[PDB]
Symmetry: D2
Subunit: 317 residues, 4 copies
């Protein structure tokens, strides 16, 4: 039987017998994602070029406005906003959403794959909503995932029930379930990091990458891929296995990616798919944040690959 | 004034006072590309998943059928076909087209950017049309370019008048001219290659990459990007500058990329944009092919970057 | 605040605290309507004409399969099927749906507006479901409405809470609420019927029409409009007010339109909008059917217009 | 072989060995029609209703559709470099194309015919007629005051259940279906010809009290045939492109005649009656004012009205016989 995101989410909600807010939140996100995809694909660009005589801001406004209007949220943290957005009282719901509305958009001028990343928390206290309501470890996530605006648009949704992938059919604006309960390979054959900055690598990163290129045994070197857009590189890691790294070094001891709306949602997707996501020192999902925009190092992907990285990491510790 | 691919090509044709065949060929190609884009973005995928109860083959069929019916072609070489396709007598025109209908599609399962690459030649010999009509050096190209199905769909068309970039507006199915007479940066800050083959690199490649990561003048290291899809990596190279390399290795001693419908069209785009494209020993466009599917090593991109590589290549003889 | 069909329906469901089946049914219908719209607008028609080398059947299959897979239905009556379809046990829910999947499609060759009409009933008994479960008076309707595939695509949904109109935004495949709690004009200025059957008209219809052309109170004559596609004619009646007639004639002594999936849903939409719908002798919604394909005469629209017709009808005893 | 509007037009141009301006004009129009279709189908309407907040709505998105359609047609024709004088239903005076963008063609068009009732989602359309400028004077409004006989090409786009462009030239009438998945007009019916006689009549009968006596009698013959044949069916959408296109595909007769209150009719000669009359005649149909062929009226005002009776030749001839009987 054909299954849509709308039907899938609603059936998960019925089985859980929640209040319906999470379902409304997910419907609003899906609508925002379809609108981002339409704009990312440049629908209407002819009008901008005068046929009748910003993209990351627009994407943020789409997510912000759809989530506010869901009546399911009270605190919104975006990569685009200095401060957490507090939802107005008459529209408050119980969920906190941290999101990057258009990840990788810095390089969108080369038409590289871009994406939207989101993580959904339940507000824990009855206090007046504030930025602190988003300062939860990723292990508290109720749902997380991403939309990839690649060759096609796909939404990957991770919940307690596992990871499910939905392909956007743009002819009808429906996300069609195409991969159920996905699991990552135990061990992959691709490593993914920006090797242009090798001179700044932590010595452990240098050694691990060297083992991928010059294996000490008789196995094949790993292939290298680095899109530079986190959603694309993570999704490839999910689909094909392997390891993705944006690690710490001396110049950047906390990494560069952002914990709340990049590392944690991806870490959650990975673990729900049977993968791993570490800072090197702890699981990403166990970091307790103190700042809504704080950075975290992230090494994620197939468990055997991440464990091997941790073995080398400890060797230099 | 807004300008479309249709209007642009027709206006180039009027000025040249040709017979109109090249214009009809390009109109057909544009139509095929819009049809490829729609299928790549998964329009109609819900019917495949049962709402009412292969992508590279379809792409090949679209290009083949649109080109045959243009009455402008006589010999068609596709990555998808072992032998050259000879157009039936009643539809034959004067042009030979070499194309990759859906480049990068091996990894389309992770929704990586894919593309269509094409090169157009005038049939040179007066013999009955045959596979040999496609065995022309790239310097004989009349027109070449590619469509990138990335975050948006863009057609890059290079002719004697230069390189022009058209964004597909999917709301109206029109390619809108958005970048005229494009020129690549003289020198970039990104290098692009699969570093997993580091164990197989010739010393010149190894040294060049080492200069990008550890510059001897103590300037900033280059960033690294490698999508693994040639159209995406070359388009980023064109738009941001820098260098793209696919040299020979032990699996691919004559290189990996195909001369006829990957290297030559990209080399032609590069040169018309003020860039360079070399095998290491000669310019790609000067290689005389003997086999329609033969491979070639390629180093292309910003001229200062390729020239620096060639100095290293010469230092190692 | 922007509102979607999905969000709107789910909020009505949350307030009523039902089992969720009606919501899942309405989501499935909405999906079917978007797919019918895409096909009606001829998306993909180029593939039918050989670019790479039935509409009412497809519409019926789309509605049938989406309703079956909703797990919300047990009995399905379609204009396209001689007998009621009994949903197999593992997919059964409590609702009976009567629908015309592509109304007006006989003239779709002139690209006349077409539409989808539906009426939803709750099955009352614990008996095994059967065709007789659809033999309910319109008064028992739980929900009804139509999709109009006109210059744009619009879904009109009537429930106990009133009538709401949603515009399909094809850029994102979303139904946007554009008119809330719709009410028809008390009196219109347009009458709508096929006057080619004037030779067969009941004297009451003949006199009523003569009053529209030669008003007895010295007002302006009514304009005439008759698309010949019921959904288009009824929707204009809803939007501008006025009256729509399909009375009996010699070919159709019980009228021509079908009671279960044309007259009753339109009668229900009209009444929830403050209009009227009569056979001449009784309210459409009060007719108790004995056959799922039985026909009924129908006069509907603004209350003052319908009352005026009824006064003429009673004058003719 | 599959055929597109672009390929088809270019092939007619190659055979004629013209300058290519007419082909560029038709390409520009085709682009404008695709944009009108997208807007008419309400692409992007969610932004008007606040999906991105009360900030991200653009200038073109707020414009009413008939203004936007006029802007699309105007700008695409100007930029074709093929036109010198443009007449639109929306503009009191003719637009004279600026000198550096001038070509030899005069275009009269109705950018969004029927849009007054677009609020009920009625079929709407774009109507166009193309003339070659005849005089050596500087281009001016007078260049559009040509009889329909002088038309080089005409036709319409219908935004109905699907979008179709009907294009009439000397080679006849061809119908192209817009495939919105790829934005291509696909040729679906070649060299179209109307039925000799139909079974549908189309006019606003609500205004029967004002009918010309000949119209009253003709309509009475359609509803109460004297030879005991079947009465005609009636259809009246109220949108000319829809009613005329149905007439072309199914046959029959469409009337917007004169009366004492409107002795010259209601529809506009330059950009409604003449293009529709040209299409009808190229399809083997007829189009009359009652007194003469529509295409023979020589206009004196770009917005002058004309009565029109068109459709299957047998039907129009029967109408004219009744009209002559009433002298
Ligand atoms: C995706 C998801 C998972 C778990 C919980 C939720 S929820 O809290 O939103 N609850 C619901 O949706 N309940 C619903 S849905 N239909 C009914 C009849 C009910 Br009771 C959503
Ligand atoms: C893109 C391009 C460049 C050079 C040559 C060509 S061509 O060989 O196709 N010739 C033409 O198009 N001639 C045309 S087009 N309109 C007219 C009136 C003429 Br004469 C195409
Ligand atoms: C449109 C409509 C109106 C009335 C009744 C229905 S229903 O019978 O389908 N019930 C529900 O939807 N219950 C729902 S929805 N979310 C929750 C948490 C619950 Br409890 C649907
Ligand atoms: C549709 C139409 C019909 C007749 C005349 C025209 S035209 O005047 O625009 N001329 C052309 O198109 N010439 C063209 S097109 N390609 C070539 C090589 C040439 Br020569 C257009």
């Amino acid at each position: 039987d054909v299954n849509t995101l709308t039907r899938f989410v609603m059936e998960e909600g019925r089985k859980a017998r929640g209040t319906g807010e999470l379902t409304q939140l997910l419907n609003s996100l899906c609508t925002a994602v379809k609108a981002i995809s339409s704009a990312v694909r440049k629908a209407g660009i002819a009008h901008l070029y005068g046929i009748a005589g910003k993209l990351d801001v627009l994407s943020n406004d789409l997510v912000m406005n759809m989530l506010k209007s869901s009546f399911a949220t009270c605190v919104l943290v975006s990569e685009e906003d200095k401060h957490a957005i507090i939802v107005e009282p008459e529209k408050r719901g119980k969920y906190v959403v941290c999101f990057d509305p258009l990840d990788g958009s810095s390089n969108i001028d080369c038409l590289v794959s871009v994406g939207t990343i989101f993580g959904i928390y339940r507000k824990k206290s009855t206090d007046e909503p504030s930025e602190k309501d988003a300062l939860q470890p990723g292990r508290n996530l109720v749902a997380a995932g991403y939309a990839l605006y690649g060759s096609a648009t796909m939404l990957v949704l991770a919940m307690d029930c596992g990871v499910n992938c939905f392909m956007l059919d743009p002819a009808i604006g429906e996300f069609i379930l195409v991969d159920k309960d996905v699991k990552i390979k135990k061990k992959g054959k691709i490593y993914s990091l920006n090797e242009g900055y090798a001179k700044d690598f932590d010595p452990a990163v240098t050694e691990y990458i060297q083992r991928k290129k010059f294996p000490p045994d008789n196995s094949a070197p790993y292939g290298a891929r680095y899109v530079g857009s986190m959603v694309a590189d993570v999704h490839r890691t999910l689909v094909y296995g392997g390891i993705f790294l944006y690690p710490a070094n001396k110049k950047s001891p906390n990494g560069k990616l952002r914990l709340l709306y990049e590392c944690n949602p991806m870490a959650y997707v990975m673990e729900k798919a049977g993968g791993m996501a570490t800072t090197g020192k702890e699981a990403v999902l166990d970091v307790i944040p103190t700042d809504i925009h704080q950075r975290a190092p992230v090494i994620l992907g197939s468990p055997d690959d991440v464990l091997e990285f941790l073995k080398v990491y400890e060797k230099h510790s």
